[PDB]
Every structure is written in C-alpha cells, then in structure tokens.
Amino acid sequence: SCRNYSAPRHGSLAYCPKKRAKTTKPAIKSFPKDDASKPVHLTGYLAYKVGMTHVVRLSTRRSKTERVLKETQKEVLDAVTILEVPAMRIFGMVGYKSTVNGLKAIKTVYAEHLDEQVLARLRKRNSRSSKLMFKLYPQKYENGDIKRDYELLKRESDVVRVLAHTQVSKIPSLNLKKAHILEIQLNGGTIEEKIEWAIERLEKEIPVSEVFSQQDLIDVIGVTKGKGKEGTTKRFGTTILQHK
Amino acid sequence: MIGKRIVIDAIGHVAGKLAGHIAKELMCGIEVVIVHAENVMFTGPIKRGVGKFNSHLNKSCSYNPLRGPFHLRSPSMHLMKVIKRKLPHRKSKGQIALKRLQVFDGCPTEYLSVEKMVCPRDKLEYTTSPIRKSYKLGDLMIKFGWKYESVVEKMNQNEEQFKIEETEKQKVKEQKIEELKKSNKFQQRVEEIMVQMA
C-alpha cells in the first residue's frame, strides 16, 4: 500500500557511500581550462587553517528597480576565516601525454639541490636514516642527461605541471618536520614557453601574491572534522520514535 | 591452431556479422587484434539506435548498483561486449578464449607496419541493399559520453602520413630494381653463379 502522507528523503545520495578519507592531505584533481591567449601562470597553492573572527563592512547593494533617491549606505557584520600561507619552493617538473586512457606521465625532473625538509617526506620514520637518498642524482647534470630529458619533455607533451613543497619549519605549532608536496598546473602560452618559465624558477620561492589578489573568487578543498561511529539520527537526520 | 595471430581492419563491416566470424576463430585458438573499432557500421537510422541504447541504461540491480550491469561507453569496449556474448563465457573454455582478443579504437603505433586482413562477406556493400540508411559506432557513442574522440582524430592523421611515406618509399625501390635487372652487369653474374651450380 502507498504511504499515508508525502515527505522528502533524509540526506543526499550524492555522498553515499560515506566512507573515511584515505589521508589528510588533498590533491587538486581538476584544473580550469587552459587558454593559449594569456601569459604563463600558476593555478593553485597550499594553506593552513588558523581560526575565525568577525568584521564590519559597508554596503550599498539594493534592487536596480528600487525607486529610492538616496545613495543609502549600511553596515553589515560578517564572520571570516584566517589562513596562513608561507611561500612555497619549486623543486621539479612533470610532463604528461594524452591517450585513449587519459593523461599519463612521461618523465619527472628534479633540481640539483634539495632541502632537508623535502627529503624528510621520502622516509617513514624521521630519526632513523642513513640519509643516502638523492646523493647519486647530481651526476646527471654533468652527463647531459638533464639536457636530453628536457628535449623529450619539450618534444612530446600536452600538459606540464611543477612540483612544490611548503616550508613547515616556519610554523612551529604544527610539530612537523616533513614538508607537504603538491603538483600544480601551468596555464597560458605554448609548451615551450611553459617549460622555459619553469626552468628559470627551480629552487626559488614563489609568494602567494603571484597567484591570488584581493576580491578574487577561489575554491577551497579540504577534509572535514571527524566524529567517529554514529547512529542514524545524527548521520542522516531521521526522527526519534515514540516515547514508550 | 594455437600459435597463429591475425590483425583485422574493422572499417566498413556490419558489426553483428563480423562478430560471428571472429568468435569462431577465438574458439580454434587464434589470437585476434581488431583495429579501427570506431568505424564499424550498423544498419537503419540512428534514431532507432538511440532508443535501443536508452532502454539499456534503464537496466540496473534494484538493491545494489555496484553488482548490477556495467554500461560501457567506448567503441572498442562496446564491440568487445558484442563478441563476448557469442562465446561460452560462464565456463572456463570461454574465459580462456576471451583472453586471446584485443580491440583498439584507431590504429596504435605498434601495429602500423603489420599487414592486415578483411572479410568480404561482411562488408556493407555486399551484404545489404543500397537504398537504406546506416550509421557508424563512433557517431552513436558521442551522444552517451565518450570523451576521447579528438585523441582518435590526431591518431588518424599520423596513419595518413605513414601511408604516403611507405608507398613513396616502395615505388622507388620497384623502379630501381626493375630498371637495374635489365642491365648486362646483372645478367652476366647469373651465368657466373650458375657455372658453379650446374
């Protein structure tokens, strides 16, 4: 038989199955469309959540059809979040090729000198290492392997991305000695221009002012607070049954 | 026979007719590679094809969609599933047979040089009347979310380059040898080697 009265569903099926995220650090998985008509620029960055406060702003927004003569100005109180963004350092690049199975990576190329903070991500336990990690790679600069590598990237690639890490040693409250590593896409110009722009900047520091400015719209990707195992009343919002 | 391989150019064949011939070979031990899956032809208007495909997407497992049917959206994979159900795939003999088959949209670089076979009985211009409509599988599959059309257009342009280069490279050797072999300097040594084999 049909149910007696109509009502909406509890919770959205767009988020089922609701399983736990695998690790706490997110990759940007989707990037805005490239346009060859513009200069070479970066498309993303990493940040740390500090906390919240509130502000008062002035406003003058009203219906275009509102017949009121006076240029009314009004105070509005708003809540805001603060994020800390120290400069990231560039340490390598990756090229990709388009196939019937999507984008696949061709080769990765690293800077001649790498920092202790970034090498620390490559080992599991910080305090127990022989530190023989990248010690043989610098020969590839002498041998011309680097110059052969750039040729292959420049010859056969559709998309180019840089590798950047964050300077965790500047934020002591994190209690963290391993940097976080992110792969960031370059839009604008041609493949050759993109590669030259990257090559000029390995080992250097890019400030956040390169990427974003005031009044801009941005997308924020993150992992939510954890709450453990929970019942249906809190997980999906269903009503509590009769008291007896 | 086990140990024989065959490469098929799929263009201009009617899908359900080629699939029957291919499936018989897989059961006899041949390894088959199909190339150009996006160019196979179906008969009738495209309008009818669209409705048959809509009725297929509607099918799903009621209690758990991750068990239910998987609706494949690539020309290569679609033609693979047409061949799959003309084999005994619920049993080991069919599962062995299936692993001998590969299907590609376009022509990959490892198969440009290899000589290629064709099936005259299944070509559209033999097996159907001229006065009725048809469509390509590549034309139907863009409407249900295939995303690699442009990648295949770029491949198709590399093939044309290779065809013109190889034909130009061949015609010169044909001319060279045929002009050479009329000469006395050639026809002399015929005798010089035969003196030692007669």
Binding site: - | M1, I2, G3, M27, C28, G29, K93
Partner: protein
C-alpha cells in the same frame, strides 16, 4: 636439441590441421571420435581424397608419450571437415591444437 629437429622434419612433409570438437549432438558427446579441419580443403569432394590417411599429434612437453597416432575414417558435413580416431581418447584440454596429416594410408588395426 631433438625436439627442434623433429618439428622441422615434420613441418617439411605434412599437411596441417586443427582439432576443434568431439563428435556430439546438442546434448551428448562421443569422445572416441574427434573432428579436424585441413588447411586448404573446402568441399566434401576434395576431402574424400584424405579418407584412410594417417594423422599424428605431437606434444613435446609431455612426460609420458611424445606423440599419439591415428587415422581419418570419414568425411563430416559439406565444407571439407573430417572425422578421425586415435590410439587414446583426446582430452578437452587438447582442443585447438595443431595436427599433422601424413600423406600415406594405414589400416584400422595399426593406429
């Protein structure tokens, strides 16, 4: 290596065919007889000229016996396939395999 030589010797002198099924109806199988197709033989009239000829299945990876002998008994159907009998029953695992046709006749008792 004797196996590599024994193959080349056989390749130079025999016609080639493949094993594809036992004699069967829609429901039942008769594993005493097997069905073969021969390379370029494509009519029943063409196929009749092979009735009586010897056949051999050679299997080098075998630990027991390196080859099985048999004889072609009859034509089967209208497109040039044949029926044959061997000294032992052919396993379902051996379907799809290559068979050699030996260009001389033998008696049903010899196998």
């Amino acid at each position: 290596m004797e196996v590599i030589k024994k193959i080349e010797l056989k390749e130079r002198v025999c016609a080639k065919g493949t094993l594809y099924s036992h004699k069967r109806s829609k429901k039942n199988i008769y594993p005493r007889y097997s069905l073969i197709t021969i390379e370029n033989v494509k009519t029943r009239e063409a196929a009749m000229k092979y009735v009586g000829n010897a056949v051999e299945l050679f299997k080098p990876e075998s630990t027991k016996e390196e080859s099985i002998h048999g004889i072609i008994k009859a034509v089967h159907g209208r497109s040039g396939a044949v029926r044959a009998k061997f000294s032992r029953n052919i396993s379902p695992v051996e379907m799809g395999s290559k068979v050699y046709i030996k260009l001389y006749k033998m008696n049903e008792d010899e196998i």
